[PDB]
Design an enzyme around this catalytic site. Structure first.
Site, short mmCIF file in Angstrom:
data_model
loop_
_atom_site.label_atom_id
_atom_site.label_comp_id
_atom_site.label_asym_id
_atom_site.label_seq_id
_atom_site.Cartn_x
_atom_site.Cartn_y
_atom_site.Cartn_z
N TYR A 83 -4.98 -40.13 -28.32
CA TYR A 83 -5.43 -38.82 -28.82
C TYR A 83 -4.70 -38.25 -29.99
CZ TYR A 83 -7.74 -38.48 -24.29
OH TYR A 83 -8.51 -39.05 -23.26
N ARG A 136 -18.26 -29.61 -31.44
CA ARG A 136 -17.80 -30.85 -31.69
C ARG A 136 -18.63 -32.02 -32.50
NH1 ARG A 136 -15.54 -34.11 -26.32
NH2 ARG A 136 -14.25 -32.24 -26.42
N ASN A 142 -15.66 -21.62 -17.89
CA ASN A 142 -15.75 -22.89 -17.33
C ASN A 142 -15.08 -22.91 -15.88
OD1 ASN A 142 -15.77 -25.15 -20.08
ND2 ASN A 142 -17.32 -23.97 -19.50
N1 LIG Z 1 -10.24 -41.37 -19.23
C1 LIG Z 1 -10.77 -41.70 -20.44
O1 LIG Z 1 -11.14 -42.61 -20.81
C2 LIG Z 1 -11.17 -40.20 -20.95
C3 LIG Z 1 -12.02 -40.25 -21.81
C4 LIG Z 1 -12.73 -39.02 -22.65
C5 LIG Z 1 -11.90 -37.90 -22.14
N2 LIG Z 1 -11.20 -37.94 -20.97
C6 LIG Z 1 -10.32 -36.76 -20.71
O2 LIG Z 1 -11.18 -35.72 -19.90
C7 LIG Z 1 -10.86 -34.53 -20.88
C8 LIG Z 1 -12.25 -33.82 -21.00
O3 LIG Z 1 -13.22 -34.37 -21.84
P1 LIG Z 1 -14.23 -33.54 -22.87
O4 LIG Z 1 -13.23 -32.86 -24.00
O5 LIG Z 1 -15.35 -34.64 -23.21
O6 LIG Z 1 -15.10 -32.66 -21.84
P2 LIG Z 1 -16.47 -32.07 -21.83
O7 LIG Z 1 -16.30 -30.95 -20.87
O8 LIG Z 1 -17.47 -32.95 -21.76
O9 LIG Z 1 -16.42 -31.33 -23.30
C9 LIG Z 1 -15.66 -30.21 -23.71
C10 LIG Z 1 -16.10 -29.79 -25.00
O10 LIG Z 1 -17.44 -29.00 -24.91
C11 LIG Z 1 -17.21 -27.90 -25.42
N3 LIG Z 1 -17.57 -26.90 -24.45
C12 LIG Z 1 -16.82 -26.80 -23.34
N4 LIG Z 1 -17.27 -25.61 -22.34
C13 LIG Z 1 -17.98 -25.07 -23.33
C14 LIG Z 1 -18.77 -23.78 -23.22
N5 LIG Z 1 -18.57 -23.00 -22.00
N6 LIG Z 1 -19.64 -23.47 -24.18
C15 LIG Z 1 -19.85 -24.05 -25.16
N7 LIG Z 1 -19.13 -25.31 -25.56
C16 LIG Z 1 -18.29 -25.83 -24.50
C17 LIG Z 1 -16.15 -27.89 -26.47
O11 LIG Z 1 -16.55 -28.47 -27.60
P3 LIG Z 1 -16.74 -27.64 -29.19
O12 LIG Z 1 -16.33 -26.55 -28.57
O13 LIG Z 1 -15.86 -28.41 -30.06
O14 LIG Z 1 -18.26 -28.07 -29.09
C18 LIG Z 1 -15.26 -28.52 -25.77
O15 LIG Z 1 -14.22 -29.29 -26.63
C19 LIG Z 1 -10.37 -35.09 -22.11
O16 LIG Z 1 -9.58 -33.77 -22.86
C20 LIG Z 1 -9.52 -36.03 -21.44
O17 LIG Z 1 -8.25 -35.38 -21.04
C21 LIG Z 1 -10.71 -39.17 -20.42
#
Ligand SMILES: NC(=O)c1ccc[n+]([C@@H]2O[C@H](COP(=O)([O-])OP(=O)(O)OC[C@H]3O[C@@H](n4cnc5c(N)ncnc54)[C@H](OP(=O)(O)O)[C@@H]3O)[C@@H](O)[C@H]2O)c1
Ligand SMILES: NC(=O)c1ccc[n+]([C@@H]2O[C@H](COP(=O)([O-])OP(=O)(O)OC[C@H]3O[C@@H](n4cnc5c(N)ncnc54)[C@H](OP(=O)(O)O)[C@@H]3O)[C@@H](O)[C@H]2O)c1
Lengths: 133, 326, 326, 133
Positions: free
Chosen positions: B55, B229, B298
């Site tokens: 990251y 994003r 959330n």
């Molecule tokens: N194991 C792996 O290979 C792997 C891969 C990927 C991720 N992960 C882990 O999983 C974590 C979470 O993944 P993710 O960031 O993709 O999660 P997600 O919950 O799918 O997306 C979070 C993103 O969506 C938006 N968001 C969240 N809550 C919101 C709300 N209430 N209203 C509007 N927009 C909202 C924000 O983006 P914007 O505000 O920028 O639009 C935020 O950055 C990562 O940070 C990491 O620790 C692991």
């Protein structure tokens, strides 16, 4: 899969391939859900506190693709129980019996009609009534 | 109903929601915000924070690490995780070889200014490394006190079971968790393949992207908002997704789900996150957030969870039309 | 007759009496006293001192640790023990998970200003943690030189045997001792369940509260004395006990025992403590003391021990009427 | 309990549940005090330096809930000794014999009276006296 499965029969260790078991999925060993109960995660084996001699035949049944031969050293009543246990199914059981010299007697036709039954019973079964006798 | 739960069947207790740092920390947001997000989450009982060597080229770990140091939180009250695969441009800086697991974890620990992580993950499977080598390396870092436990990310059940059997064979330590993608539009692995593992060998799931990077939030019903994003430099591929024919279909299904959300008295993000937690096999959901408002909303997913009755779940499955066959 | 004995069947030799620090150290008494108590005990051959991360929120370890440092006693002449379960308000600061065993023991060691303890204990069983995890963590701290041995407190025989078999299964280290409550009014576990374990797998008992917190001393024959543990802020529950219908019955039985004490030429506390040592399965009794007089008297229990003949033991059992059925 | 017990018979490893043994508590294996002597704390197993073939039958006797069948490959004298050893009891022993084709001869009634005994012995046992012969 060729992932290896260890089955511990009262201490006697058996190993086979998962695809050998998967071959028959109605069976205890062939069904993940049915054998789950016997899995020991500490040792990565399924444990059965069961008769030892009977097993090879049970395993060979999977390896052979259907051959269920009772070991010479195992009583027919104990083996058949083991077969019942491992849920090999009614087909295997029948073939086994047949090969074991037991002929199905099938079933006896029944009169249904109250009278014939009433009569037929004392003309072919002395058992049926003291009068039948 | 219980906020905290065991990670798989291990003795490690994590909150059902954790905070991740992908895209955000050291990247999209300002460390002032990052501190704010962690502070907010920690004050709300969240004890799980996930990061990775990949990251922001290591800066996510640096930022996360700084906040923990600045806040002075007791290390024993936190569950920090890091995931290792791609650690460098050099050939030997990627993969699950013993060399890269040890060197990668050691460098993350240095960036985190931490003695150890609670769980170290294999960020993805490695076809080029014998399972034995990987399992011995993970077991090594645990015995060196560099990690408390280890897990697999993105592995198949078959591979997870191979790690477990290899561990039993050599008296090593089995993995205790798989970090799987999971949301309403990616259900197959969690709802069909992982449960067996949970019941058979105790491996639990720690799911990521519960909002499919924001797609499931509903924020994209009308196009790509500014500062979302999908609009970031480097995240075009997400943009292509949303706007695609499949993307359109998803957004349309989301409008159908909104009615479910209102029935349950919650927002779509809350529903989506709670949905991920409806089944025991999932130990925790890692959230993503680019601001404090998102995180505060959330976290409310926990209030929804008790309302997901079979019936509701059925209704959703119908709306989605993608319930995987067991 | 022998002052020193093996802790279970391990090679660790402890005095048959040890000094605990619950309630007293960093709490009810002044460190000036605490030093006095330890000094007194050490000069009398007592080499065993028991403490816990939970006593006085860690201050008991700090005080005990300071005395050892100030007196300069040779570390090799002491047997220090500490017990771990509740180490913090945070979710991850309690239990027998690998995380809490390592972190809890490390923090106790820091408070004790000691490199290691001789025996680390699991302060109570943990339903939420697989035995394997606990046994591997204990084995880990021993291999890290943080402890010489480990034991279980408050476990059932079934659990102790599970730890032992799990240890044999994975080539780990089995526990060598169980810290069980034992006194004239709590006999069941020591006299019925633990002996088998002693003979079968070598696990010995290190009993606590031999005076049932002072109840068996006789000091409560007339009510709650001032400055007695029962009168301390926080110890009402003890007070409720003494005054209860069951409490009254105990005190009445104690009056019957006094005659036994006089027959044997000793005080009731001495009799009570020696009684705990009448059976081989008990390796040592951990005493509690809020002043020097108490300690000097209690140590005299060793002179009584040779007089506990079967007959006397029978007589007591009759007075008590609570001999457990084998 | 389902706590697992390992019994090592001259190297041949057997495993069962403690509740399977506890089923019969008069027996060597079913009595903690009696089997204590054979426990190896280093390996967490009870060791018996004894005939190997006989054991399954002995273990199966517990698993089956009472079935004591002598293995076909084991001499009746060696097996019966093993039965004696494991203290399966006089009931199991008798059933075993009976099933093995040995009928108890019970006991022969005795005169008590000195005279009858004196006489009865030379009228039914030529053995009893040279005169009886
Ligand atoms: N194991 C792996 O290979 C792997 C891969 C990927 C991720 N992960 C882990 O999983 C974590 C979470 O993944 P993710 O960031 O993709 O999660 P997600 O919950 O799918 O997306 C979070 C993103 O969506 C938006 N968001 C969240 N809550 C919101 C709300 N209430 N209203 C509007 N927009 C909202 C924000 O983006 P914007 O505000 O920028 O639009 C935020 O950055 C990562 O940070 C990491 O620790 C692991
Ligand atoms: N493993 C576990 O979970 C566990 C649990 C509890 C304790 N322990 C251990 O066991 C140790 C001993 O337990 P304990 O303190 O309950 O022991 P105890 O022997 O039952 O009670 C000692 C207390 O009784 C009083 N007393 C002692 N001797 C006396 C005498 N001669 N005359 C009058 N009063 C006397 C004192 O209290 P007052 O003077 O204040 O009345 C003293 O603090 C602890 O310190 C700890 O190390 C272990």
């Amino acid at each position: 899969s060729s992932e290896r499965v260890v089955i511990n029969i009262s201490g006697l260790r058996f190993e086979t391939q998962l695809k050998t078991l998967a071959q028959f999925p109605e069976t205890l060993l062939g069904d993940p859900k049915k054998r789950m109960r016997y899995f020991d995660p500490l040792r990565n084996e399924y444990f059965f506190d069961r008769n030892r001699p009977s097993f090879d035949a049970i395993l060979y049944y999977y390896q052979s693709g259907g051959r269920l031969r009772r070991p010479v050293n195992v009583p027919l009543d104990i083996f058949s129980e083991e077969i019942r246990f491992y849920e090999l199914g009614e087909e295997a059981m029948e073939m086994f019996r047949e090969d074991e010299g037991y002929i199905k007697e099938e079933e006896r036709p029944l009169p249904e009609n109250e009278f014939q039954r009433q009569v037929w019973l004392l003309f072919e079964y002395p058992e049926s009534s003291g009068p039948a006798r | 109903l219980q906020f905290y739960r065991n990670l798989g069947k291990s003795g490690l207790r994590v909150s059902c929601l954790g905070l991740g740092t992908w895209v955000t920390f050291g990247g999209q947001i300002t460390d002032e915000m990052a501190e704010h997000l962690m502070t907010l989450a920690y004050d709300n009982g969240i004890n799980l924070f996930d990061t990775a060597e990949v990251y922001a080229a290591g800066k996510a770990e640096v930022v996360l690490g700084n906040i923990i140091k600045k806040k002075g939180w007791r290390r024993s009250s936190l569950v920090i995780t890091t995931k290792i695969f791609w650690g460098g441009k050099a050939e030997t800086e990627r993969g699950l070889s013993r060399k890269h697991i040890i060197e990668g974890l050691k460098a993350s620990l240095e960036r985190l200014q931490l003695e150890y992580v609670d769980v170290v993950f294999a960020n993805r499977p490695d076809p080029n490394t014998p399972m034995e080598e990987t399992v011995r390396a993970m077991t090594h870092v645990i015995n060196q006190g560099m990690a408390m436990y280890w897990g697999t990310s993105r592995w198949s059940s078959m591979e997870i079971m191979e790690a477990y059997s290899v561990a039993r064979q050599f008296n090593l330590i089995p993995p205790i968790c798989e970090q799987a993608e999971y949301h309403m539009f990616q259900r197959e692995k969690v709802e069909v393949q992982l449960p067996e593992l949970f019941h058979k060998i105790g491996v639990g799931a720690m799911t990521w992207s519960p909002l499919a990077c924001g797609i499931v939030s509903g924020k994209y019903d009308s196009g790509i908002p500014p500062y979302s994003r999908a609009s970031l430099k480097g995240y075009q591929w997400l943009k292509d997704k949303i706007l695609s024919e499949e993307g359109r279909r998803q957004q349309a299904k989301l409008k159908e789900l909104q009615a479910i959300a209102e029935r349950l008295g919650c927002t779509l993000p809350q529903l989506a996150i709670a949905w991920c937690l409806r089944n025991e096999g999932v130990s925790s959901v890692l959230l993503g957030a680019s601001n404090a408002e998102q995180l505060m909303e959330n976290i409310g997913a926990i209030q929804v969870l008790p309302k997901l009755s079979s019936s509701i779940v059925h209704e959703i499955d119908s709306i989605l039309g993608n319930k995987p066959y067991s």
